């Protein structure tokens, strides 16, 4: 009866989805300076988030053994897991211990693994719950899910991450406590959304429903496995302004794509194929730039900064739009159709991360750049 309030509440509910991982990733530079691992930490966090897909195996087993039980119990378990994990991370992130003879960060990595589990279960737990609503709220859900990534980047901007050795404006404790506040707000918004709602076969093997799952898997394998790995190697040779602009504008291109989808939405499979193609084009240009990390073409000229920022903006916006559109097309099916859309996203992301591990952590194909020097 009150559509704007429902839009706001579903937006906040969706915002509290992937905030912990998207905050850890942006905070990595402040933490790296103290931990004994060094700059090998982004390859540990990646493997942890890839292994976190065991939350699906637990959600499925609980949905099997308890067949007709309630549907809001996994949502609340995931929310409490996230809140308590972020509090414990804010409290005990700097404890090291000798494992295998080497000093290692056990508390940081264990809590990152728990948060990855919660965030991976959040998909197959939160997304199918929107079958109780008209399809115009999937777009608000995804807009909030994009704000989930946009807000920590602004927080790291205010903190002063990446200023080059200056001392930030506040330590990592304040950052993780702000993340805890975000997660509590999301839990309260979902509790209100529960008060707002009234008291209570041939498709899976079709070609039209496989053409959408393949698109979801491929676009998510690109956006969630490869770009987080080649980001710095692509953007760093062009300075500190290029890197900051690329990061912030790529993070802000998701909510704007979801707003544009709120405006007009595509519904033909061929249009989504074309959009995915023009996104893969830029996604491949970025990696072709990252392979030549020492000296890419057009370095030190104002053309390269623009040509490397616009690629990130275009890629992330196009893929977010295709995700929103394909998910809204599969909503006609039910909770079963929506459940299929989360599993595909997660399988694609897992395949992307597993495929990106060997070029990055085994053979070292990309070569880093020494600061204040032009090789
Ligand atoms: C290392 C890493 C792995 C991620 N994996 C996923 C993922 O599997 N699925 C997902 O929806 N988002 C994942 N994200 C976040 C994804 O970009 C997220 O949808 C947007 O950040 C906010 O929606 C990941 C983010 C990072 C930094
Ligand atoms: C795997 C890896 C990731 C890196 N990530 C960043 C980064 O995110 N931001 C950055 O400024 N430098 C990054 N660097 C470069 C790092 O800052 C560089 O080694 C030091 O500046 C050299 O003193 C990275 C280097 C490596 C090897």
Swiss-Prot record:
Span of the signal peptide: none
GO cellular component annotations of the record: plasma membrane
Compartments where located: Cell membrane
Effect of residue 46 to F: In BVVLS2; decreased riboflavin transport
Topology versus the membrane: Multi-pass membrane protein
Keywords on record: Cell membrane, Deafness, Disease variant, Host cell receptor for virus entry, Membrane, Receptor, Transmembrane, Transmembrane helix, Transport
Regulation: Riboflavin transport is Na(+)-independent but moderately pH-sensitive. Activity is strongly inhibited by riboflavin analogs, such as lumiflavin. Weakly inhibited by flavin adenine dinucleotide (FAD) and flavin mononucleotide (FMN).
Annotated InterPro entries: Riboflavin_transptr (IPR009357)
Catalytic activity: riboflavin(in) = riboflavin(out)
Record note on what altering residue 352 to S does: In BVVLS2; decreased riboflavin transport
Disulfide bonds: none
GO molecular-function term, one example from the UniProt record: 4-hydroxybutyrate receptor activity
Superkingdom, taxonomy of origin: Eukaryota
A single GO BP: riboflavin metabolic process
TM stretches of this protein: 8-28, 41-61, 80-100, 106-126, 141-161, 175-195, 210-230, 245-265, 272-292, 299-319, 337-357
Tissue specificity field: Highly expressed in brain, fetal brain and salivary gland. Weakly expressed in other tissues.
Effect of residue 217 to D: In BVVLS2; loss of riboflavin transport; loss of localization to plasma membrane; no effect on protein abundance
Disease named in the record: Brown-Vialetto-Van Laere syndrome 2: An autosomal recessive progressive neurologic disorder characterized by early childhood onset of sensorineural deafness, bulbar dysfunction, and severe diffuse muscle weakness and wasting resulting in respiratory insufficiency and loss of independent ambulation. Because it results from a defect in riboflavin metabolism, some patients may benefit from high-dose riboflavin supplementation.
Family assignment from sequence similarity: Belongs to the riboflavin transporter family.
Role summary: Plasma membrane transporter mediating the uptake by cells of the water soluble vitamin B2/riboflavin that plays a key role in biochemical oxidation-reduction reactions of the carbohydrate, lipid, and amino acid metabolism. Humans are unable to synthesize vitamin B2/riboflavin and must obtain it via intestinal absorption. May also act as a receptor for 4-hydroxybutyrate.
Name of this chain's protein: Solute carrier family 52, riboflavin transporter, member 2
Organism: Homo sapiens
Gene: SLC52A2
């Amino acid at each position: 009866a009150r559509p704007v309030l429902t839009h706001l509440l579903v937006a906040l509910f969706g915002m509290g989805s992937w905030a912990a991982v998207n905050g850890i990733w942006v905070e990595l530079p402040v933490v790296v300076k103290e931990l004994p691992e060094g700059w090998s930490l982004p390859s540990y966090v990646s493997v942890l988030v890839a292994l976190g897909n065991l939350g699906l195996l637990v959600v499925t087993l609980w949905r099997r053994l308890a067949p007709g039980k309630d549907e809001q119990v996994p949502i609340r378990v995931v929310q409490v897991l996230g809140m308590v994990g972020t509090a414990l991370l804010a409290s005990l992130w700097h404890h090291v211990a000798p494992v295998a003879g080497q000093l290692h960060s056990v508390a940081f990595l264990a809590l990152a693994f728990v948060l990855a589990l919660a965030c991976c279960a959040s998909n197959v737990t939160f997304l199918p719950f929107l079958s109780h609503l008209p399809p115009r709220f999937l777009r608000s859900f995804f807009l909030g899910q994009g704000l989930s990534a946009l807000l920590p980047c602004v927080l790291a901007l205010v903190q002063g991450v990446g200023r080059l050795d200056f001392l930030e404006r506040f330590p990592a404790s304040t950052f993780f406590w702000a993340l805890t506040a975000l997660l509590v707000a999301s839990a309260a918004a979902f509790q209100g959304l529960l008060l707002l709602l009234p008291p209570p076969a041939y498709q899976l093997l079709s070609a039209r429903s496989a053409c959408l799952l393949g698109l979801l898997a491929a676009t998510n394998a690109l956006t969630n496995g490869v770009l987080p790995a080649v980001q710095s190697f692509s953007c760093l040779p062009y300075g500190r302004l290029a890197y900051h602009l690329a990061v912030v504008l790529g993070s802000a291109a998701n909510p704007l794509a979801c707003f544009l989808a709120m405006g007009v939405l595509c519904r033909s499979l061929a249009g989504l194929g074309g959009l995915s193609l023009l996104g893969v084009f830029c996604g491949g240009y970025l990696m072709a730039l990252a392979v030549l990390s020492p000296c890419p073409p057009l370095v030190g000229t104002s053309a390269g900064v623009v040509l490397v920022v616009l690629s990130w903006v275009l890629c992330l916006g196009v893929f977010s739009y295709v995700k929103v559109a394909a998910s809204s097309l599969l909503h006609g099916g039910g909770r079963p159709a929506l459940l299929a859309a989360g599993v595909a996203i997660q399988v694609g992301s897992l395949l992307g991360a597993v495929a990106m591990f060997p070029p990055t952590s085994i053979y070292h194909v990309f070569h880093s750049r020494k600061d204040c020097a032009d090789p």
